[PDB]
Design a protein around this nucleic acid. Structure first.
Ligand SMILES: [Zn+2]
Lengths: 141, 136, 340, 52, 94
RNA sequence: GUGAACAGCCUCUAGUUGAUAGAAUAAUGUAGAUAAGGGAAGUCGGCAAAAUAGAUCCGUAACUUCGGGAUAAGGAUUGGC
RNA sequence: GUGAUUUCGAUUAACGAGAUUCCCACUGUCCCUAUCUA
RNA sequence: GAAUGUUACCGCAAUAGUAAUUGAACUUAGUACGAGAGGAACAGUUCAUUCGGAUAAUUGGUUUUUGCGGCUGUCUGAUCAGGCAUUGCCGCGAAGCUACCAUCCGCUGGAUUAUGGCUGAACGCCUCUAAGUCAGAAUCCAUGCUAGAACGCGGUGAUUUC
RNA sequence: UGUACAACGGGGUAUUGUAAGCAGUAGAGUAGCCUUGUUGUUACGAUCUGCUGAGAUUAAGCCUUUGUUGUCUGAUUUGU
């Protein structure tokens, strides 16, 4: 088995799921669902569709280059089976995914810094610009 | 699977009924292939015979060379637009419908096949496998 | 049109389809149940690493649809003896266990909430001082019975079903003499029997059930809701309820149970033992189904080949599910607005 | 073609069934009986735990 | 074919393809190689000096943690004052 | 108002809210739609549906009673700012 | 009595809820059905 | 669906119906057989055809989920939010339904026919037949599968306080 | 009068595709001003960007629930 990734939105494709299109130039587009497949047939641009990983990585919603992200590639040169190597791989995969989660949370927090400041500024503008409703509020309280 | 095929063939979704025109994907000089019959087709009342990937049909040449026209000849279906399920787990389909001319023993009349050939057709017909450049 | 052997196309008299033939008995073998009761709980997909010499798919992997049947252990609550007569089998004596749960006592009422719940209260008085009446009836069964069947009921309270009334059935006991069958039943009164003590992996079983109902269809008349007995369904997995990693194989190391993300549709999670059976079986989700041992010694290499599962699909069935576990879903999406 | 009720193929099926298939059946049933005995012993041990 | 005939014959014999494996240990020949773990392909992560690369990754991680890579008032008024202003804003919107 | 427009669609003045009601939602029927791959292989018979359609620019055959054929055929374009 | 007109009994542009054979396009007519609304 | 005291559960099985089908591939084998050219089958395996019974994990179709989004015209002062256009039109669309457009499942004992025999008279030979008897067809009856006699039957539970 | 049922709510699971509001020195340009530029200035401006995989819907035949509120009953008939 192999977990593929959708040509359109990059979501995982599991055995039996989705549909594959083979073009005449003999390259295979795997789609996780008919939504992505139909968008491809309509010739929409995934990099423009905000709900796709292509758009997110293009526009900076998430990190595209990272030390954790360099670990996994398609190996075209096989390695001799070695039980110790397999066990080390099984440990390292969990460790790497944990580190990548921490870096992803850090990246999102860095993206979203300033939200509290904007919220306070908008709240201050609203409260200042509406002094008369505070009177009713105090009458209630 | 008629004469010339290698082993058993599983069921694949039918895409090409009789009276359908597919592309001709070999360098034999034919441009299209019009289906008049499908070999090894079980009979049911009031049902159009149809062909799938890896099938051998009988076809005429509607468009092509004058020498190759006018004669019913065997052809083998190598591509179908109709999606079929591969047993390893994928539903897949090609862009068009395409077949190649052949002799009754399954040997290819032409010299090569252009475009991707279905894996099922290639593994069923050794001459198609020999003359294929791209197998899926 | 139609198969004339399935006439008349009328509704099944009960929702629980009857087992009309048990496997031919062999007295030398140990005592075993011929059948089991379960509840149909949805379908899913697996990847099987096929070992089938001669096939084009030998040493290759295929994807198969499977059915999951929720099978918590059944409770043994009675025994019935049958004598053969020139008119067929006739039941001579029924002996019940001393105590019965409310789960099975509900089966004997139309309006449980309004009742004094007096069922079997006078029967329990037979186990008073010596159990002499119970022993006399068991002796009668041992002396005259030629066929012994055990009364069992499902533990429906262990399922996600809204029904509180348990299903009760007779299961033939095969193997051993009549006295050994009766002793086994008497020992198992008020005890549970687990699905792995009846079936095992790679075994071919039969599914007896009432099919999906479709009402009136255009001659016109009733469509669906018929008793059906489908044979030769291979057991891909006998899972354990108290086992984490129900859905994990040797090839897939993800620690996950058999339950798909979001639960089975119109059926909850699987928290009991279960049977994964290749293909489909008659009935729909939540239907009570009867699993029977093969009537004949199967002569197929399919009944012999071991099943090696590579992967079980636990993606959501409530849409176009893409993720096997919520942890995978979170790791893919990332940090959402409400996470901060 | 030979029918399902064909006598020659029925004899072939009988002679095949008498061997390795039946041996597999018997071994399977013996293991199932053993684990049924284990199940009964487990429940009886829970009852003994209750008594103790 | 002689081994096949002795064991089962053609069409029923099941040849073990892991028997002619050239490995550092012979007991490894009959082992299951995992491929799926939490939505990842194991073969993708399978490569030599994986331990050395993970050591480098963890070293960079320790450096980031030491540097503080993983970590309510405004001018004029205190936390309770900004809380009261935010409460008044939510009240006004409602 | 839209629009070439007494078209169709929505609105103001004026008028009406009349048609036996209620509860369910099986097949069938009638009306209206959608559909993979193929594309008349259906049928006595392309019956019926589908496809086309406004306007601007380019461009237009055989034949002709020289008036036509002709919107022949066949292309490009159309929003908002 | 014949029914435009012209040309050589034939021929004829334009037009037709007139008749016949095909072509492109199109398609649930069909392979082969399935679903939704009132 | 009334009636067989009431009510409830688990069963039996008279009778009735009945279903599977055909082709191929591997191996046997480049063997038997044959100057050659050519060339089988049984036992053991694996698929497919037609038909049938189910089924909805997946793929595809379908949308009043009017679920989300978009568009035209008009109307509500504008925004927001909406109404109408006989489902206004468009894209996606879960659930449900559903498709040789999807998946799964479809057996094994007796008795025989033609025929091949054993013993054996008639008929001091002989004879498969006369008495008797052994094998043997996709045939028949069973097994199995569906219904269950609403005037067939059994086992079992509980049976009212004024 | 219960690991009871229901109505809400909460959490999952799915579908769509990034809400309303605000902000920007992003935006074909046009006009107004004058400290006639080498990020001089102002008004309008389809659209773009950020807050924002947001917002909306999610059982009606999806799953789950240490929350909130409530309900727990009328009528008829049956005997060997
Ligand atoms: Zn998508």
């Amino acid at each position: 088995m192999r977990i593929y990734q959708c040509h359109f939105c990059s979501s995982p494709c599991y055995p039996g799921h989705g549909i594959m299109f083979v073009r005449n130039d003999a390259k295979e587009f795997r789609f996780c669902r008919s939504k992505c497949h139909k968008a491809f047939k309509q010739r929409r641009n995934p990099r423009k569709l905000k709900w796709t990983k292509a758009f997110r990585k293009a526009a900076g919603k998430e990190l595209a280059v990272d030390s954790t992200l360099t670990f996994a590639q398609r190996r075209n040169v096989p390695v001799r089976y070695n039980r110790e190597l397999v066990a080390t791989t099984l440990k390292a995969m969990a460790r790497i995914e944990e580190i990548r989660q921490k870096r992803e949370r850090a990246f999102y927090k860095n993206r979203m810094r300033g939200n509290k400041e904007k919220d306070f500024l908008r709240d201050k503008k609203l409260v200042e610009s509406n002094p008369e409703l505070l009177r009713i509020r105090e009458v209630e309280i | 699977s008629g004469n010339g095929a290698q082993g058993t063939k599983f069921r694949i979704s039918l895409g090409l009924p009789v009276g359908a025109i597919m592309n001709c994907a070999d360098n034999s000089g034919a441009r299209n292939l019009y289906i008049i019959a499908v070999k090894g087709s079980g009979s049911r009342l009031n049902r159009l015979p149809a062909a799938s990937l890896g099938d051998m049909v009988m076809a005429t040449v509607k468009k092509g060379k004058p020498e190759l026209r006018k004669k019913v000849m065997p052809a083998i279906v190598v591509r179908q637009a109709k999606s079929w399920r591969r047993r390893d787990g994928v539903f897949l389909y090609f862009e068009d419908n395409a077949g190649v001319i052949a002799n009754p023993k399954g040997e290819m009349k032409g010299s090569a096949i252009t475009g991707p050939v279905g894996k099922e057709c290639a593994d069923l017909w050794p001459r198609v496998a020999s003359n294929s450049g791209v197998v899926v | 049109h139609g198969h004339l052997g399935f006439l008349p196309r009328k509704r099944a008299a009960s929702i629980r389809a009857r087992v009309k033939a048990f496997p031919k008995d062999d007295r030398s073998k140990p005592v075993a149940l011929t059948s089991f009761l379960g509840y149909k709980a949805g379908m899913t997909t697996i990847v099987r690493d096929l070992d089938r010499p001669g096939s084009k798919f030998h040493k290759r992997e295929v994807v198969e649809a499977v059915t999951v049947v929720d099978t918590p252990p059944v409770v043994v609550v009675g025994v019935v003896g049958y004598v053969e007569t020139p008119r067929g089998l006739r039941s001579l004596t029924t002996v019940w266990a001393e105590h019965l749960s409310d789960e099975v006592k509900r089966r004997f009422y139309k309006n449980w909430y309004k009742s004094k719940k007096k069922a079997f209260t006078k029967y329990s008085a037979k186990y008073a001082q010596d159990g002499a009446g119970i022993e006399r009836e068991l002796a009668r069964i041992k002396k005259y019975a030629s066929v012994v069947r055990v009364l069992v009921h499902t533990q429906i309270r262990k399922t996600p079903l809204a029904q509180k009334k348990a299903h009760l059935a007779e299961i033939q006991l095969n193997g051993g003499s009549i006295s050994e069958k009766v002793d086994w039943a008497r020992e198992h009164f008020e005890k549970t029997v687990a699905v792995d003590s009846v079936f095992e992996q790679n075994e071919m079983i039969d599914a007896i059930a009432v099919t999906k109902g479709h009402g009136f269809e255009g001659r016109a008349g009733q469509r669906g809701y018929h008793s059906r007995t489908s044979i030769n369904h291979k057991i891909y997995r006998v899972g354990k309820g108290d086992d984490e990693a129900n859905g994990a194989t040797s090839f897939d190391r993800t620690k996950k149970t058999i339950t798909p993300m979001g639960g089975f549709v119109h059926y909850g999670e699987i928290k009991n033992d279960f049977i994964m059976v290749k293909g489909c079986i008659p009935g729909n989700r939540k239907r009570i189904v009867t699993l029977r041992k093969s009537l004949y010694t199967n002569t197929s290499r399919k009944a012999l080949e071991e099943v090696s599962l590579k992967w079980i699909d636990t993606a959501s069935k409530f849409g176009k599910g893409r993720f096997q576990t919520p942890a995978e879903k979170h790791a893919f999406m990332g940090t959402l607005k409400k996470d901060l | 073609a030979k029918s399902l009720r064909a006598s020659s193929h029925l004899n072939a099926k009988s002679v095949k069934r008498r061997g390795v298939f039946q041996k597999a059946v018997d071994a399977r049933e013996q293991r199932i009986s053993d684990k049924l005995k284990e199940d009964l012993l487990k429940q009886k041990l829970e009852d003994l735990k209750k008594k103790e | 074919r002689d081994i096949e005939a002795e064991n089962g014959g053609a069409g029923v014999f099941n040849v073990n393809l892991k028997d002619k494996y050239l490995l550092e240990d012979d007991e490894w020949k009959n082992d299951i190689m995992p491929e799926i773990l939490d939505g990842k392909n194991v073969y993708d992560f399978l490569d030599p000096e994986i331990a050395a690369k993970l050591q480098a990754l963890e070293e960079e991680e320790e450096k980031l943690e030491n540097e503080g890579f993983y970590n309510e008032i405004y001018d004029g008024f205190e936390a309770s004052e900004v809380d009261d202003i935010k409460e008044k804003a939510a009240w006004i919107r409602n």
